[PDB]
Subunit: 462 residues, 4 copies
């Protein structure tokens, strides 16, 4: 079943079980680009719910009937709470201001509010999509507001909590591995030792700094454009509206949202999203290093490095013992690469503003939310299904410590540099160890080697 | 209702109305990254259907029971034809080889084939996911095969047909506008004239070259990895299998698919996808120019350039006549920016292969298919909802031709350079036209101006 | 005219008039990639001079002879001061750790110090390149230190000062234009009014936030790797060296350098350079918008927007009055594009660390310094040669204000929406002004139009 | 030591020993962005010399005095031959059309030709920079021509020859290693065997396809804009000039240059440079994989993979036998990252054309030439200083083959899967070899293992 609505181009059938109206149906026909995977991110829709709630509450002061305003606030809450996601079928690839989604939100909130008040759907009575739900608003300043509400909420609920879990798990392994001495690798060549915990402490620092970098990129995300209306002047709205809407959004979300000090910078550009994307771009570089390292450190069982034993996430064959594919490392490094491409997409859009309005908004916030969700989700997955279950192959690590040529410099003050190079060059030529060689040349006894060559003493300055 | 299946980690409930098995259910739990918008692109799933059809038909030669092989072929066809899309819930962000989706396809095809043969779902009887559906195959060589089948089909059915429509529509407008002389713009400054059709012929050429560039990037997309098995050697398969599978895929699709001459290059890298993405990256640069030009040429109605009258796609207010937002230009330019970011994502993944296997496959093909779909769909939308309806504002174009200072050089051979600069500098100072100025200074009569100053003669070399 | 020096691989001719030695000559033979334009950036060389000056003063505590330490310090000062630039022929495309430039610096300082002490160039007497100039230092922790010193100096001396000049000049113009009312543009379509000062105040905010973002990306640039030695443990350096050399660098530069609290994160990755590049990538988006807007606002003289008169710095043609190509806008927007590409280069390198050492260091700092130099210099050139001299074309702005159809809404309270719309639709049809039209229809008097239509009242909330 | 020249803005001191004139000096004052490393690439300057040589010979048909044309041609030849490089001080960051370098070339050629004719430098007598050297040319269609000439020459002289050397050296090693069997790596985990020759044959295919991709991106580079004049119409040039100058360039260079069939597409965009950059971006992905693989395959000597012995070009430490940093791999992988960033820079510029002229030309060709030079030079250096000298560590490969758990499947037909798996799980547990284990359990004899386990039979289909 369907109802009949009209726009300036013709009549449109609107499904009776849908709260959107003719303007949304027209948008689904004029913007058939990409399919359902391209739908406007739900976080933006929910952020509009919060936003329309705050606006309706403020415009009450300016005459808006409380019976209507309260119905708008109730319907807005349902959008914010994810109760009406099925009534937003529009894709990212619409107008660059996000007008169609703003209209989508206005139509859904009015028809739902109309229903709450016993009215007829599609009639704009008593709740009018533009005169009431969009009162004192514009697509140009509401969509940017929704972008920053959505990004802030995603950062604080998904991105940062995910990185925190990865940080804590990496820190636990650093402490767990504090006593395991292994051979370092510089240029991928054997190098002087360090503890597996020291190496992991570097990953911990990178994730710690990743969270600091994301937080340092949030202050200007908290600035809201609501109040600039069409070009940033605030024409057709009341003094104090901008500040009151921001304070209301801050109270509803619990986050320190504020009104943008300059609404022209807030409409004509989205450099804060470029900034936030850049912090996630750095995070991706950090997580690419961490994941690839763990990937190669777990390589083996015999023709790789074999320092780490990663948990199984795929069925391991009985005839292939010890073989574990680093599946989560692969998901994480693919996510990292994706974030890097998304950042360039954000950068191109952020650079192409025209005069009073940047009209790349939907694609910029899509890429920002995409990266934040992937990094957060991937961090959790990488933590629970890999990091927490990493074990050290101490037997193989200690074996390659005894077989390494790197510890020969510990003999320098006892038998001389030249005699040390002879042990090194000889063991290298013969393929044996340093101790077996040093003994068979008569340079020292086995008990002298054990006393002179101590890797535990090669882990810091003196 | 659900059935019980097991993997090496525990028992799993499998919905009875689903054809996938325990391995897929385990993948949905171990790879909760991004949500439903991150599901493996349907074109890859359908390409697996084609692929599993071709393999089952070839392995018949190697003993596979025809009753089983025919059931696999029937089930494979249903996947290829899009009849079973609801049985593939896995996201791009899985293992870098695409193993989980290969398992997803093998489970769905066996359970469906089992159903066709009157067996019990989840039993692997008589159709075994690995021994029968995955016979002589590996995730390492089947997923690359599916990537290239999907990319080729998308290029030929979506991308190129969309660009062809945009090309034809731009060509029609070039011919329609062949006689409309306007002022050129270099550095955005007024310049010598050219026809609106000449300017549009440049857009036509860019789209024509875009199609040539995409086609020139397809020869190596037609190379299929099927037959390299785990590392490219073709271990555990029969001589001629690689060629027969490729010829079968070519026959099923109607496209010139061939087996990759070097299976190690086909598994260890995906430089063909980087190549194809680069051609779409060029296309995006072309379409960014075309769309932004049309955007600015339609700016107005009075404080812009106002050369073009774009069709309305949003409701136009009665009190705002002549104001038309270039909505499709904004969708197209956002798509262009997205393609540029996707290309970088493809580039990072394509560069990070390790030894015998590049394990960034799902994210690379996702970004490739994303760009191809968006460019194709956006081309159609931009054509039908903007280009075909563009009109020239001949009145405003001709008015600015009479008011332009650029045509003064046509007077050079008649009244001298110095006398021409006087008319120019005077009209510029006074804000009048060249004809009104040239007359009031007594340099020539109105009938001499009309005869000497002819823009139709300023459109080519002499 | 050469001297003969020796390394382990044989004989090498060194020009008598160069201070570098055999190792540098060896490096020039094995890394002939790109030519002179690819030489290691001078700021990196100067930063090395600061570092070697700092180390030499600190290592006197370890027995370094004061007479030699004093000569090393004097020669290091000459390097830091840009006096020995012709003695560094190595390209960026060398060892990924920068070891060879470290050896280049050690040899130049050693031979210059030898010269000051009356010794023979190339003898290593009395100043040894490794035992004295490289004392307590590693071939892995010195280059990361140098590039952070160089990055910090370039930010504070070039990048921020350049952005500060641009901020101030834009702010002065924002005030000079605070009363010039123009027609706003959204989607490039005519929109409600705003002043040039308001529009320019958005540019000012963008530059102010750019400087904030760059400063917010510096805290981890000030962390120095010096002391981590080969793999980050500090093996074979002295306790307290790390903190002492960093404090000496801070005192020599007046910048808050400190030792890196985790040397493994400091050697294995350069996320700080990625962070700083990201800040400059956001800045480039801001400058692209500003420069491109001023570009189009100055378009004309007659077939463009024509709101701004940009300074003419290059030669015009007397026959072309009014035609000024915005060449400073082109240099700026080209620089912005370069910074965006540079950022991807930095991102790829930063993502590809391996275990204990990221070996993409030279190319990472090269792109960071390149972007910082271009942004800083372009901001000065754009300021001095364009912004400070921008003039408003008030005569044309006033004409376009009077001819705009946007102000028609001011008549709504006085003659009703229905009648205002009739005026706009008629003015649009006849190509006349709102005032002329509203009078011919007889809906108001000329004195009534001037009293009701006041753009000065349409510039903010009420 | 200066001379005094004059432009419309006053007096300018020109060094007596320079051939450039007032306009060039003016350009050096207004565009002080970046310094000498940012000077216009020399290949662009040489290409201008070819172009001006071609134009001068053709314009004799238009009355150009042969005695002057001959001097222009001789001076243009000196520019093309790299003999007047010190007379071009302008940076890339100039007018987006490259006009000032065009004037730089016109002044240098004019003053050098004046000198050859016994005239006074700076007098424009008898050789005028614009009336003679720039005859029949525009300030907009000359730079696009020059940068396509430069791009084509650099591809054919530097890029492809470098890739050809790398292809050939990799192919020779593929054959030298055709019988050395090693353990394959998928996901970095141990996998079924393949030969080093097979693995290397993949690298060979990648380079072969890279050269194909680059050549496939050239056809539209050979299209020259010369003749389109200011906006593409060819106004104020002669019929036949476009086709004649292009054929003269083709004859002078031996490359298939032709006039662009659509001069509007040729001036308004540089999609061909984006296409060519994309080809080099694919090449960079290929070289990253090859260089990084060889990097890790040479990792060791003992705590890495250790399959390859790379040539040692820099100084080792006698105490560190076997430690060879893969420095050529680092220069190559850094170059690859740079090319990827360069491509985004080219992409952003190529996307930002405006109507009749893309004014990002200098930065676009700079990045194209930069990538082509680095790729070509790095391929030669990587070839001569690494690839040709790579040796296989056959002793270690054989040891790791015998210690691998991967070959255990060869025992399946002889003792059954159940028993083979028992051997693998035991060898893995005890850390012993398959042979040792299979004997202690008594499942076979040593002579039986050698007859059944033949890796030479596991290298292809059957």
């Amino acid at each position: 079943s369907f109802r009949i609505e009209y726009d300036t181009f013709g009549e449109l059938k609107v499904p009776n079980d849908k709260y959107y109206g003719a303007q949304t149906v027209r948008s689904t026909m004029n913007f058939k680009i990409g399919g359902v995977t391209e739908r406007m991110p739900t976080p933006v829709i929910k952020a509009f719910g919060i936003l329309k709630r705050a606006a309706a509450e403020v415009t009450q002061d300016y005459g808006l009937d409380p019976k209507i305003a309260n119905a708008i606030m109730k319907a807005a809450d349902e959008v914010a709470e994810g109760k009406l996601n099925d009534h937003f079928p529009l894709v990212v690839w619409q107008t660059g201001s996000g007008t169609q989604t703003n209209m989508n939100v206005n139509e859904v909130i009015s028809n739902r509010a109309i229903e709450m008040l016993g009215g007829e759907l599609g009639s704009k009575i008593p709740v009018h999509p533009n005169d009431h739900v969009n009162k004192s608003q514009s697509s140009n300043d509401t969509f940017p507001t929704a972008m920053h509400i959505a990004a802030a909420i995603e950062v604080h609920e998904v991105l940062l909590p995910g990185l925190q879990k990865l940080h804590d798990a990496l820190d636990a392994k650093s402490k767990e591995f504090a006593q395991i001495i292994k051979i370092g690798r510089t240029h991928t060549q054997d190098a002087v030792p360090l503890t597996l915990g020291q190496e992991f402490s570097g990953y911990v620092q990178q994730v710690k700094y990743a969270m600091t970098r994301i937080k340092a990129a949030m202050p200007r995300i908290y600035e809201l454009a609501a109040g600039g209306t069409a070009v940033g002047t605030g024409l057709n709205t009341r003094i104090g509206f901008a500040e009151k809407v921001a304070a209301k959004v801050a109270a509803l979300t619990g986050l320190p949202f504020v009104t943008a000090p300059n609404k022209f910078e807030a409409l004509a550009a989205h450099d804060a999203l470029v900034e936030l994307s850049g912090a996630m771009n750095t995070t991706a570089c950090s997580l690419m290093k961490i994941a690839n390292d763990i990937r190669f450190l777990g390589s083996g069982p015999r023709s790789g490095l074999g320092e780490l034993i990663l948990p199984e996430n795929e069925p391991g064959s009985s005839i292939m013992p010890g073989k574990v594919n680093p599946t989560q490392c692969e998901a994480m490094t693919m996510v990292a690469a994706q974030v890097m491409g998304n950042h360039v997409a954000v950068t191109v859009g952020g650079s192409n503003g025209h005069f009073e309005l940047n009209v790349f908004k939907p694609m910029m916030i899509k890429n920002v939310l995409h990266s934040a969700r992937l990094l957060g989700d991937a961090s959790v997955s990488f933590t629970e299904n890999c990091v927490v279950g990493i074990q050290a192959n101490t037997e193989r690590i200690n074996k390659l410590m005894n077989e390494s040529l790197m510890l020969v410099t510990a003999l320098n003050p006892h038998i001389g540099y030249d005699k040390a190079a002879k042990i090194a060059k000889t063991a290298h030529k013969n393929g044996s160890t340093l101790k077996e060689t040093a003994i068979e040349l008569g340079y020292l006894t086995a008990e002298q080697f054990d006393e002179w060559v101590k890797p535990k003493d090669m882990l810091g300055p003196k």
